[PDB]
């Protein structure tokens, strides 16, 4: 933009879509409960010996 | 050469059954619990801004 000769002023319209923070979650239909975190359920068992 | 020092396959299966029965005896019920307790149809995918 400087190379082509535009000088001395700039006005930018910040977008609607990107400038904010946000979250995503599951909302249960029966009750307004929000689930935002995840977990791994697993049951390792160690076999050691001869 | 050396002989009769390791189990057969069938005895290995029997010992594994015994171990499974013992471990079940210690822990009769499934301990772990999951935050998501319903099928995918029940939940509603929504997006929010930052909490509060």
Swiss-Prot record, chain A:
Where can this protein be found? Virion
**Source organism superkingdom:** Viruses
Q: What further note is attached to this protein's record? A: It is uncommon for short-tailed phages to have a tail tube inside a non-contractile sheath.
Describe its assembly. Interacts with host NfrA receptor; this interaction is essential for viral adsorption to the host.
Q: What does this protein do?
A: Assembles to form the non-contractile sheath that surrounds the tail tube. Allows viral attachment to the host by binding the bacterial outer membrane protein NfrA.
The name on file for this protein is Non-contractile tail sheath
Which source organism? Enterobacteria phage N4 (Bacteriophage N4)
Gene name, per UniProt, is 65
């Amino acid at each position: 933009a400087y190379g082509l000769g535009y000088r001395d002023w700039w006005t930018t319209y910040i977008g609607m879509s990107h400038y904010w923070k946000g979250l995503t979650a599951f909302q249960d239909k029966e009750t307004g409960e929000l689930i935002t975190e995840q977990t791994v359920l697993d049951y390792p068992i160690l076999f050691a010996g001869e | 050469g050396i002989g009769q020092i390791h189990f057969n396959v069938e005895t290995s299966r029997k010992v594994c059954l015994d171990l499974a029965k013992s471990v079940l005896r210690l822990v009769p019920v499934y301990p772990l619990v999951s935050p998501v307790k319903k099928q995918h149809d029940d939940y509603w995918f929504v997006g929010r801004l930052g909490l509060d």
